[PDB]
Structures are given as structure tokens and as C-alpha cells.
Design a protein around this ligand. Sequence first.
Ligand SMILES: *[C@@H]1O[C@H](CO)[C@@H](O[C@@H]2O[C@H](CO)[C@@H](O)[C@H](O)[C@H]2NC(C)=O)[C@H](O)[C@H]1NC(C)=O
Ligand SMILES: *[C@@H]1O[C@H](CO)[C@@H](O[C@@H]2O[C@H](CO)[C@@H](O)[C@H](O)[C@H]2NC(C)=O)[C@H](O)[C@H]1NC(C)=O
Ligand SMILES: *[C@@H]1O[C@H](CO)[C@@H](O[C@@H]2O[C@H](CO)[C@@H](O)[C@H](O)[C@H]2NC(C)=O)[C@H](O)[C@H]1NC(C)=O
Ligand SMILES: *[C@@H]1O[C@H](CO)[C@@H](O)[C@H](O)[C@H]1NC(C)=O
Ligand SMILES: *[C@@H]1O[C@H](CO)[C@@H](O)[C@H](O)[C@H]1NC(C)=O
Ligand SMILES: *[C@@H]1O[C@H](CO)[C@@H](O)[C@H](O)[C@H]1NC(C)=O
Ligand SMILES: *[C@@H]1O[C@H](CO)[C@@H](O)[C@H](O)[C@H]1NC(C)=O
Ligand SMILES: *[C@@H]1O[C@H](CO)[C@@H](O)[C@H](O)[C@H]1NC(C)=O
Ligand SMILES: *[C@@H]1O[C@H](CO)[C@@H](O)[C@H](O)[C@H]1NC(C)=O
Ligand SMILES: *[C@@H]1O[C@H](CO)[C@@H](O)[C@H](O)[C@H]1NC(C)=O
Ligand SMILES: *[C@@H]1O[C@H](CO)[C@@H](O)[C@H](O)[C@H]1NC(C)=O
Lengths: 126, 273, 366
Amino acid sequence: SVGLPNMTQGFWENSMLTDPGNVQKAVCHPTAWDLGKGDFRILMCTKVTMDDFLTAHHEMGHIQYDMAYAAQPFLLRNGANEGFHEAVGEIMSLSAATPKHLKSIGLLSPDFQEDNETEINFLLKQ
Amino acid sequence: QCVNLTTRTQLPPAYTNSFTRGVYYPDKVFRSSVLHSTQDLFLPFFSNVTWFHAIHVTKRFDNPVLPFNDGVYFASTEKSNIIRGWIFGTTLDSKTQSLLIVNNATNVVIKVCEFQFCNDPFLGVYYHKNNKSWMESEFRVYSSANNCTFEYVSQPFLMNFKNLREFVFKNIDGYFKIYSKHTPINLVRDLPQGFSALEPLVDLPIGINITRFQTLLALHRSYLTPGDSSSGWTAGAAAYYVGYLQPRTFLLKYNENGTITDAVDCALDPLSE
Amino acid sequence: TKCTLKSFTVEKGIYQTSNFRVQPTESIVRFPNITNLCPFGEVFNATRFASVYAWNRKRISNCVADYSVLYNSASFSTFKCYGVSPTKLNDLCFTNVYADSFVIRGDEVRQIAPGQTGKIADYNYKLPDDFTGCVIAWNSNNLDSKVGGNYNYLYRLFRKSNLKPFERDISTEIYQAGSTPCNGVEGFNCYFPLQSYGFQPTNGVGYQPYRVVVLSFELLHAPATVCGPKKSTNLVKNKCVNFNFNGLTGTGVLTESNKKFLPFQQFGRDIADTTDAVRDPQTLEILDITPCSFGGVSVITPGTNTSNQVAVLYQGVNCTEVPSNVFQTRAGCLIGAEHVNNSYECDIPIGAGICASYQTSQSIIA
Ligand SMILES: *[C@@H]1O[C@H](CO)[C@@H](O[C@@H]2O[C@H](CO)[C@@H](O)[C@H](O)[C@H]2NC(C)=O)[C@H](O)[C@H]1NC(C)=O
Ligand SMILES: *[C@@H]1O[C@H](CO)[C@@H](O[C@@H]2O[C@H](CO)[C@@H](O)[C@H](O)[C@H]2NC(C)=O)[C@H](O)[C@H]1NC(C)=O
Ligand SMILES: *[C@@H]1O[C@H](CO)[C@@H](O[C@@H]2O[C@H](CO)[C@@H](O)[C@H](O)[C@H]2NC(C)=O)[C@H](O)[C@H]1NC(C)=O
Ligand SMILES: *[C@@H]1O[C@H](CO)[C@@H](O)[C@H](O)[C@H]1NC(C)=O
Ligand SMILES: *[C@@H]1O[C@H](CO)[C@@H](O)[C@H](O)[C@H]1NC(C)=O
Ligand SMILES: *[C@@H]1O[C@H](CO)[C@@H](O)[C@H](O)[C@H]1NC(C)=O
Ligand SMILES: *[C@@H]1O[C@H](CO)[C@@H](O)[C@H](O)[C@H]1NC(C)=O
Ligand SMILES: *[C@@H]1O[C@H](CO)[C@@H](O)[C@H](O)[C@H]1NC(C)=O
Ligand SMILES: *[C@@H]1O[C@H](CO)[C@@H](O)[C@H](O)[C@H]1NC(C)=O
Ligand SMILES: *[C@@H]1O[C@H](CO)[C@@H](O)[C@H](O)[C@H]1NC(C)=O
Ligand SMILES: *[C@@H]1O[C@H](CO)[C@@H](O)[C@H](O)[C@H]1NC(C)=O
């Protein structure tokens, strides 16, 4: 809806969106892996948590940023500096943290107050 | 792969008085008992047709490279199927394309490639007394094959003069029509006197120019002749004729069933006119 | 009659006004059977293909190509054509078609087009600007990809010169960019021309192997031996219908014949060069062609000053084929006259011994 293209057919069949548990050892650390040949996949044990929601948004933003310059040579398929590659992923999480977005998606109920106390608390937490 | 036939005496060519032969259906249109007149390339009646005889007593084996002006009339006065096929082209080398119609007693192979034929191409068979049957010996028509245009392979089979097979070849509008009529004969004369309407067999569009042709005969290399890489070959009793076509006007007499029974060349005598 | 004679009054007698004729129906068309279309069992459905530089050049000239089975198929991704309409492919003919077959990367399929350039379009396979044909490319990542990455395909990456349209070369000389001479190995300015490709099943769009084929159409002075399928509709007899058999067209009623044609004679004719018999290229049966009925319409009418009732005569037309009694005569069908047995003196000559008159509650009698 923002304007980013869709995902590939290999992103939804190779990513591990479910923690296997004690059946096999697997590190649960969110990292946006870029294989370089169109194989984009996220490695994260995403669960039912708002923090996990924001982390998944950050990982998807990183994947979109990596796919943005996919039509470039190997020496160019990388961020300009060491700060933009993470800022492009963090701005999506900072924008998605608004309560109006969660209310429009379906998480937050329509009946919700808009007092300034919650805004001040969120600003202080940030 | 080319083998030049040695030990051959040169004899002057001969001729014969061809009878009312070389009549074929010009088109595929049925007609009733009514007569018809057409101006297609036909064979003039009572014309000089070159006689090529090849027997062994000095031995004689004549198969030169004859030109192709407007069409040829080929006849097969055989008794053991000595004639194997024909060759058509303009250079007989890798320069241009050439038509090669060869039948190795198993398949009627017709290919249109840029063959580079030899000077004296032929086919050879072998006779084994232990097997009590004949068999092929070698196939040295050409050496290699370049890019082709058309190829065809018939269904597999096995194989005095008591057989006659006529042929008429033409080349107009790229198409190469072939007429044939296999009729049985029983006589000792050179060319029988009679009438036969040749029917169209194939119309393969070679799409290439044809200015010369050559007949491919068979040879024998049994134990009667000394074995040699170039000599020691013999040929049975066989002969073929070559008649050139000319633009004339005939009067075809169609039968009530559609078979041409009689015809008259309106160029020989005033009665025909 | 008043309009043909250019007079408001018509005298007693028989006059010819128009000419009756029968119209055809549905325009039956016939053609021989359609068997052994083309040996497409080794190009569009093959198992093992070659590299981009080892593309095959199989000739398609002696078989009837059917482009409807590929245009209407959903198993292909791109079916673009250039210089020819994709719908009329089965209607026209050709002379020789070159069947290409080579596997290329997903993102490199766009460069395979007339008038385009690129690294692969100029060093491996180039199309001319005047190319007249169609491009076909489908996904093949499900069978061409293997575990561990596919490296069985190679391609040319650098060379001193480009490739001409419809050119194939297997030369593998080393490229030399700088002035330093190369002895046979790589180095500073020496490189190898061939490079192994990579195809993995986990790759996304743009890197998957897409089997793209090129169909070039050429029409030179050679006879057209390759065409497309035709209609070959159904036939019917005992009706006036314009027909179109293999090589000719006509109009007339067909019927079951009894003649015995020759195995090679297809058409039939007779004196004065009139087509009267054609064979069915599917049933191998002979049909007698008969021209549909036609005749000059004659209007028998008395004097206008006497009466206005008129009679119609269809000369040579049977009464069963005309569409107030109806009486059939040897001269044709007569409509509007009552047949009587009394023999009077001939007043208006009709033909074949029959005459008309205006006698007694009052009409015209034949
Ligand atoms: C059969 O005879 C022909 C005719 O002489 C030979 O063809 C010649 O081959 C030589 C090769 O040295 C050429 O220099 C000549 O120009 C050729 N002549 C012609 C007319 O083509 C052929 O080599 C002979 N074949 C064998 C096996 O002896
Ligand atoms: C030649 O290609 C055709 C493609 O049109 C193949 O036809 C397909 O065959 C498979 C299995 O045989 C079917 O599942 C498809 O539905 C067919 N496609 C059609 C009918 O459009 C055909 O099998 C190929 N021939 C060979 C020998 O491989
Ligand atoms: C051409 O027309 C049709 C097209 O399939 C076929 O006609 C068959 O002919 C055979 C022999 O004459 C009959 O036994 C069949 O009943 C006919 N119909 C079918 C559906 O097979 C056949 O292919 C051709 N007809 C010929 C050669 O007569
Ligand atoms: C045929 O050739 C012979 C010589 O072989 C000659 O005497 C005769 O006149 C020729 N006939 C014709 C019609 O040319
Ligand atoms: C005749 O030649 C054809 C083509 O080379 C071949 O397929 C066939 O086996 C041959 N027949 C024989 C040698 O009897
Ligand atoms: C002739 O017989 C021999 C002995 O078995 C055999 O090897 C050879 O092939 C036969 N030749 C034929 C059948 O042409
Ligand atoms: C075959 O190769 C020759 C070689 O020059 C070429 O001229 C010709 O166009 C090619 N194709 C045909 C059908 O002869
Ligand atoms: C045959 O020769 C004529 C005369 O020059 C030429 O126009 C024609 O192109 C030739 N045929 C072929 C197939 O080249
Ligand atoms: C022609 O056909 C008829 C009828 O089938 C037959 O009797 C006759 O023998 C055939 N041949 C000739 C020459 O009439
Ligand atoms: C008209 O058709 C009928 C019906 O078959 C027939 O009996 C009659 O002879 C035909 N008359 C003419 C003149 O054709
Ligand atoms: C004319 O004569 C025929 C033959 O007997 C008869 O059927 C018909 O009824 C007669 N018509 C009149 C009007 O008498």
C-alpha cells in the first residue's frame, strides 16, 4: 500500500517463520539475509508480540531496501554508507508504531481515546 | 571414397527409332471420351533416342553426364533390376545443390543436398555362394553431404528382358514432377512398339535448377573376376534410353474411364495436322 | 412488364422481363485431412537443451506448422510477435522456418528482441532490425534447476567484435584488451571467452532459467511448402451451394456420382472446358457438379385495356425449384394459369404445344 513491490516465490517457501523448538537447534536472531541472486528471506522466530511485529516490519523494510538496488552489479548491491542501510529499515518501524495504523489494520479497536498522556509517555519512552 | 572404373573399352554411341512412346497425362483433370488438345512439353514421335547399352562379353559400361534441356524420357529395359537410381544437378559438387534419387533395393531415398559426386559413381552388389542369395557390396555415389533442403525415405522392403519401366522428368516453376509407368514386356527387341500412358508419381519441389543428369547402374564383383580396388567389375545385360522433350501439340484420345488410349503428334505428317 | 417495355400500356402477348436464379447457402469449403502437422516433438517439449551460443538451427520447411496450439496455450509466458499478425499465422504460408533452442537467464529474455542491445544480445545472439517473426519464452526453473546450482551452461562474455544477425560461431579465442600479447593463458589483459552460468532453484524472478525459442519466418523464391490449418467445413448435397475445394472454387449443386476417376485425377471436366466433377479430398468420393437452375422469366399477359391479371412462366425452371395454380410444362413452370383439357386455337404461344388465352369466373387458361 505504501508503494513497494511484492515478494518473490522463494521468500515464503524458504524463510523460517516458525520456531522449531527442541526438535533442532536454530538461532533465533532477526537478520535480513541477502544471497545476491534474487533469493531474499528473513531468519527470525517471529511470535505473537508487538515487539516481534515491529522487528518483522524492520526486517521487511531491510529486504525491500536490498531489493531496491537488485538491478546493479555485485560491487553496487549495497548501501551508500553504514547508516542508511539500517535507517531505511528503522523508519518503517517508527512510522508503523502509530496507534492509528494498528487501528486501521484491525489490531486496535476503533473506540480508543486520544489523550495526551499516552503521547507524552510514548515520546519519553522513545 | 571415389573409385574410378578401369579396364573399359570406349565404344561409339548408338541410336534407335523410338515408337509412339512418352505420352503422359499433362494435368490431373478427368475427361470423358471427348478428345483434347494441349501444348505441353511432350516427346516427339519417331524421334532419335540415344541408346546406352552396357553388357559384358570387350566389356561395355556407358553412363556419361548428359545435359537436361527441357525434360528427359528415361526407359528401363532390364531383367534383374540393374538400374539403381538417377542423379540431377548442375555442377555435381559442393558449389550448388543437386538432386540424388537412389534406391539401394531397400528404400527409395530422395535427398536434395549439395553432394559432391565422383567422376564415375555407381552401386555394387556381392554374390555369396554359401548364402545362395545376393547382397549389396558398397555405396560410393558421393563422399560427404552438405546442408540439405528435402529428404525422404520410403518404407523398408526386400528385393531375356521381362520388365519395362518408363520415366519422364520435368522442371518447371521449381517443382520437379516425375511420371512413371511400369509395364511388363516379353521380347528380345531393343524398344517394344506400343502405347502406354505414364501417370504422375511424385511432385517433390526441389526448387533448384537442373541442367545435367546421370544414370546410376549396378555392377557385379563375384569370384569370376579377379579382386581389385579399381578393376574386376562386370555388369549383366541392361540398357536405358534418353529422349529429350520438345514443345509440341498432341491430340489425346481419352477413354470413357479416363485412360489415354491413343495419341497423335501433330508435327510429323500432314495427316496428323 | 410496364417498366421493361417503357410504356404504361402493355399489348397482348408474351414478354421477357427478368432472369431467375438460385442463390448459394453457407459457402461450403473443403480441404484434405490434417495429419502429421510438424515434428515439434524435439523443440518445444525437449528434455536437454544447449547453451546460448550453441543454439540449434533446425529447418521447418516440409511440414504444416500449427501456430494455434501455441498461441492459445497458457503454458507460455511471452508470445510476442513482430512483423506478422499472431492471428493470421495459420492463414498464410511460409517457405522455411528456423527452429532455435537455447536456455538463458530470466532477466536476459528482454534483450532478445529485434532492435534491442545488451551484453548478451550483442555477444551471444542478435536479431536483425527487419526481423519478421515471433518470440516464445516460458518458465523452466522446475526442471532445469538442480540442487547445488546448475553450471552446465556457458556463454560468451567478451570478444573483439559483435555478432551478425543469424550468426553462430564456436570460436573460443582468448580476449586481448591491452597491447600486451597473450600466449594462451589469462593475466593482465588476457581473459577467457567462455564463462559458466549459475542456476539455483531458490532464485527469484529474473535469475530462473527461461527456455526462449526464436521462430524466424522467411519467404524467398522457393515454393511455399509450409502453411497452417484450414477450415474444412461439412458438405451437403441436393442443394445449391457455392463450393471451394483444394485449388478451385465454383457454384452449383453437388450430387452422388457414378464415374470412376483415376487415383491421381482429382478434378473433372468435359467438352468446352466446363467443370462438372470434383472428388471429396476426405471421403475419396466423386460428386457431379450441376449448375443451379436459371431461366428467363416470361410474363404472359393479355391486353392492359382488357384485364390486369397476368401469368408467370419460368423458362426451363422446374416447379419444385421456383420458390393461382401451378402447372409444369415442357417449356418450364407456369404459375397463374388453370390447366384445361379442351383444345382451343393457339392465341398466346407459350411453348411445347401449350398456348394461353383469356377465356371464361374469368382468368387465363393453359
Ligand atoms: C578419377 O578421374 C578423375 C579425372 O581425372 C580424377 O579427378 C582429378 O583429380 C586430380 C587430383 O590430383 C585433379 O588434379 C584433377 O583436376 C581432377 N580432374 C577432374 C576432371 O576432376 C580423380 O581423382 C580420379 N579418381 C581416382 C580415385 O583415381
Ligand atoms: C510435446 O509437447 C506437448 C506440449 O503441447 C506435450 O503435451 C503435454 O503432455 C503432458 C504430458 O504428456 C500433458 O500433461 C500436457 O497437458 C500436454 N500439453 C498439451 C496437450 O497441450 C507432449 O507431451 C510433448 N511430447 C513429448 C513426446 O514430450
Ligand atoms: C480423411 O478423412 C477422415 C479424417 O479423419 C478419415 O476418414 C476415415 O476413413 C476411413 C477409411 O476410408 C474410415 O474407415 C473412417 O471411418 C473414416 N473416418 C474416421 C473418423 O476415421 C480419414 O483420416 C481420411 N479418409 C480416408 C483416407 O478415406
Ligand atoms: C538418327 O540417327 C541416324 C544415325 O545414327 C541418322 O542416320 C538419322 O537420320 C537420325 N534421324 C533423325 C530423325 O535425326
Ligand atoms: C539404403 O540407404 C539408406 C540411407 O542411407 C539406409 O537407411 C538403408 O539402410 C539402406 N539400405 C540398405 C543398405 O539395404
Ligand atoms: C552370408 O552368410 C554369412 C554367414 O553367416 C553371414 O555372416 C553374412 O552376413 C551373410 N550375408 C548376407 C546375409 O548378406
Ligand atoms: C546451404 O549452404 C549454402 C552454402 O553457401 C547456402 O548458399 C545455402 O543458402 C544453404 N541453404 C540451402 C537451402 O541451400
Ligand atoms: C536458375 O537459373 C535462373 C537463370 O539465371 C535464375 O534466375 C534462378 O534463380 C536459378 N534458380 C535458382 C534456384 O537459383
Ligand atoms: C472401362 O470401365 C468399364 C466399366 O467398369 C469396363 O467394363 C471396361 O473394361 C473399362 N475399360 C475400357 C477400355 O472400357
Ligand atoms: C421437374 O421435377 C419433377 C420432379 O422430379 C420431374 O418429375 C420432372 O420431370 C421435372 N421436369 C423437368 C422439365 O425437369
Ligand atoms: C383431363 O383428363 C385427365 C385424364 O383423364 C383427367 O384426370 C382430368 O381430370 C381431366 N381434366 C378435366 C378438367 O376434365
